[PDB]
Design a protein around this ligand. Sequence first.
Ligand code: A1A78
Length: 167
Amino acid sequence: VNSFSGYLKLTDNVYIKNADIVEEAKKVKPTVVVNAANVYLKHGGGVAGALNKATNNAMQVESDDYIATNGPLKVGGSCVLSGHNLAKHCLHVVGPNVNKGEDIQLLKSAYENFNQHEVLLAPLLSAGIFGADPIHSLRVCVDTVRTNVYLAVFDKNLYDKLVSSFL
Ligand SMILES: CC(C)(C)[C@@H]1CCN(c2ncnc3[nH]ccc23)[C@H](CO)C1
C-alpha cells in the first residue's frame, strides 16, 4: 500500500492520472520522481522546467555540478540526483526528442531505467515538447516497465484520449 490517490489502473503495475506532476510530487513526496531530462540537464521548459522552478532552481544548480563532473547523459540514459523538496530522489531520464531528430526506438531504453526503482511517479517520456506521440509512449511504458509506475498527465484532454484508446 502506498499514498498515491485517484489513479486509474491500466495494468498490474501501471497507473495513470490527470495531474500536475509538480503538485503530485509536493503532495505525495514519493521516493522517486522522474524528470523528463535532456542530456545536458538544462531544465528550461516542459516537465523539467516546471520541476526545477518548484525547487527554486536548486535542481539546476545540482545538475550543473553533475554535468561539470560527469559530462552529458546518453539519449536513453539516466542519473539519480536529489529530489529536493519534491521527492527523496529525482531520476533524470532522457527520452529521445523527436524535434531534434533522435531515434524513437531509444524510448524503450529510456523506460528501462524505471526498472531500477520499485515505485516511481513519472511523466510520459518523450511526450509534450519532446515531440513523440503520447499514445505510443504509454504503450512502450506498459510493455517495458515492470516496477510500479504512477503516471501524471498534465493535459486533461490528452488524459481522456490515453485512457479511451488504451488497449
Ligand atoms: C501533452 C503536453 C505536451 C502538453 C505535456 C507537456 C508537459 N508534460 C507534463 N506532464 C506532467 N506534468 C507536467 N507538469 C508540467 C509539465 C508536465 C507532458 C510530458 O509527458 C506532456
